[model samples]
Target: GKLSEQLKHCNGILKELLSKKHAAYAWPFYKPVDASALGLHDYHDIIKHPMDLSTVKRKMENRDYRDAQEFAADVRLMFSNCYKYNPPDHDVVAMARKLQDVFEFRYAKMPD
Candidate 1:
């Protein structure tokens, strides 16, 4: 359960990082790949405020299963990479593993 909670907190930090939009231009060596090309924004919308999972969930519900899966995968990749570079206030290695696991699970189980 500690792992789970830590993973969730890591996810929260990732979400907050995206929410702040600071990572977009902050990390000199870890620029997020061209998000617009991936049909995603610069986390600007989610960044201005906290990332509302409920909002994301509602929006994903309207998308095709495949689309939702793709979105989840993209987010997973983003968060995973963030953890890789901009580690939070925890054991970096363990946090990285947990974040990766969360991403993998979401990418696998999410529709399509």
Candidate 2:
């Protein structure tokens, strides 16, 4: 739930198997992708909740990301912005570490 609770689901991905309300039992998605107000027009269609996705996707996608490395850099910068906007509390920092590990492992790549 934690992994799917972020922008990838809310901003990049419009609807999912579980994120939507009363899914038509589709595999990929059944509802229309959410509308956008700015850059990349993020996926932010919240069937679960409106604020569930937040502005994370907009922050990362707003940059013209060229490659995975670039995208990762943008993500890191977004997190940094998050820190700058709000002082990192214990829960915030803890969650950030867990999320960073996942990103480095998945999108960022661990390397063999």
Candidate 3:
């Protein structure tokens, strides 16, 4: 019913997540993992979905997401995959944790 509203809100959330202050942390998630280049040969095998911010943005532009929940889940999957592949003390894991917090804080305030 209110898909447009939700889409706009989701877009807004993504914008904030990629804001200047958070760019450094967001950089890793901006594009799909270049497994071979990164020497993460098992990335595809480990991360089935391999979600990223750019993929999400493209989906949003194409209106591929059915709802905000779908959008949110993809975002969560990105972070979850990061955790699954990286050690807790790794810088990438730390970045994912911080960005996840930012996303949740904004998501909680989403309008009904």
Candidate 4:
């Protein structure tokens, strides 16, 4: 239930953030092109790797729950590749900072 609730909340936030008003600014600034448009080839390949659950078992056995949790989170983040948020040409960090400043000032009803 907790996981489902979290997923729902994340989805809602993502949807709101991707609305038309946001997309109007985000799209041109981010310049997110389709993967196919980049002339990249996508091929499905199958590879076999050893599923070594032993390391996890050992960590858990050693009562290293924190390390396990951190490792899990790191793996998830790596797999998700959050670097996509920072496009090659776009200064995402600067854009984010500017956007945050804009939102704050607007909410504060300060002069632009």
TM-score list, all predictions: 0.30, 0.37, 0.92, 0.29
Q: lDDT tens digits, residues 16-87, model 1? A: 433434433323213333336644355444433322234344334454324333445555545555454433
Leading candidate by TM-score: 3
Q: What local distance difference test score does each model get?
A: 0.42, 0.37, 0.88, 0.35
Cα lDDT of model 4 by residue, 1-112, tens digit: 2223333333333333335656533332233233356442331121112111233234334545353234344323322232233445555445444433433333334222
Ranking by lDDT: 3, 1, 2, 4
Q: How far is candidate 1 from the true structure (C-alpha RMSD, Å)?
A: 12.5
Top model number, lDDT: 3
Winner on TM-score (1 vs 2): 2
State residue 73's C-alpha deviation in candidate 4, in Å. 8.6
Q: List the residue pairs that clash in candidate 3.
A: none
lDDT tens per residue, model 3, 7-71: 78888999888789898788899898889899986888888988999999888878789988999
Q: Score candidate 3 by lDDT.
A: 0.88
Clashes of 2: 2
Candidate 2 residue runs with Cα over 4 Å from true position: 1-64, 82-89, 110-112
Regions of model 1 farther than 4 Å from truth: 1-55, 64-69, 88-93, 109-112
